[PDB]
């Protein structure tokens, strides 16, 4: 048998996804999430294909930046694993 140990693969995924530019999320599920939310303000709304794409990129950019700060918070606590509270700290520092 042959395999890699935990921690080896995770690093590779970091490398690769940092490198690439495409979306790391699925589309049809996202489109629907946008609408599920949008209908709460108004029914019978429509979207251009470019409008959804704009939302996705803004969302990913937001979350990725959040994860960087989350990761730093975890490191500050001498950890590798991120916890919900590391997210919460970063957000609060930013005034959210």
């Amino acid at each position: 048998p042959h395999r890699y140990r935990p921690g080896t693969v995770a690093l590779r995924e970091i490398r690769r996804y940092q490198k690439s530019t495409e979306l790391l999320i699925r589309k049809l599920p996202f489109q629907r999430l946008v609408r599920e939310i949008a209908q709460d303000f108004k029914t019978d709304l429509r979207f251009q294909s470019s409008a959804v794409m704009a939302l996705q990129e803004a969302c990913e950019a937001y979350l990725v930046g959040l994860f960087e700060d989350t990761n730093l918070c975890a490191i500050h606590a001498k950890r590798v694993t991120i916890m919900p509270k590391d997210i919460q700290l970063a957000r609060r520092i930013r005034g959210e």
Binding site: G7, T8, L11, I14, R15, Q18, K19, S20, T21, E22, E57, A58, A61, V64, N71, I75, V80
Partner: protein, 108 residues
């Protein structure tokens, strides 16, 4: 009757001047715009444009291409901390991110 002539030629610029003059007139920035106003501004926008493109072209070369794509713009901007700041709140469509891995996460 003199021949009509583009102001951009006079200033040695590639960016349009007369248009900028118009844009300055509107957008409700002011009641009036000075003659040298759009000229000064056109030069500035052109300068900054060159800086990004130059670095982007170098970034493109580093990836062995003959063309600039949004990703090259992303890397080129960040590699110059002056622009990183100016555009420190700009999301680039398909920019990706820098390949930064924290040292404490590395195996050893």
């Amino acid at each position: 009757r003199a021949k009509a002539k583009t102001r951009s030629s006079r200033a040695g610029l590639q960016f349009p001047v007369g248009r900028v003059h118009r844009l300055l007139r509107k957008g409700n920035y002011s009641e009036r715009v000075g003659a040298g106003a759009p000229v000064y501004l056109a030069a500035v926008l052109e300068y900054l444009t060159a800086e990004i493109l130059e670095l982007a072209g170098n970034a493109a070369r580093d990836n062995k291409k003959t063309r600039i794509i949004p990703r090259h713009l992303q890397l080129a901007i960040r590699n110059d901390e002056e622009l990183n700041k100016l555009l420190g709140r700009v999301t680039i469509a398909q920019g990706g991110v820098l390949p930064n891995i924290q040292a404490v996460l590395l195996p050893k």
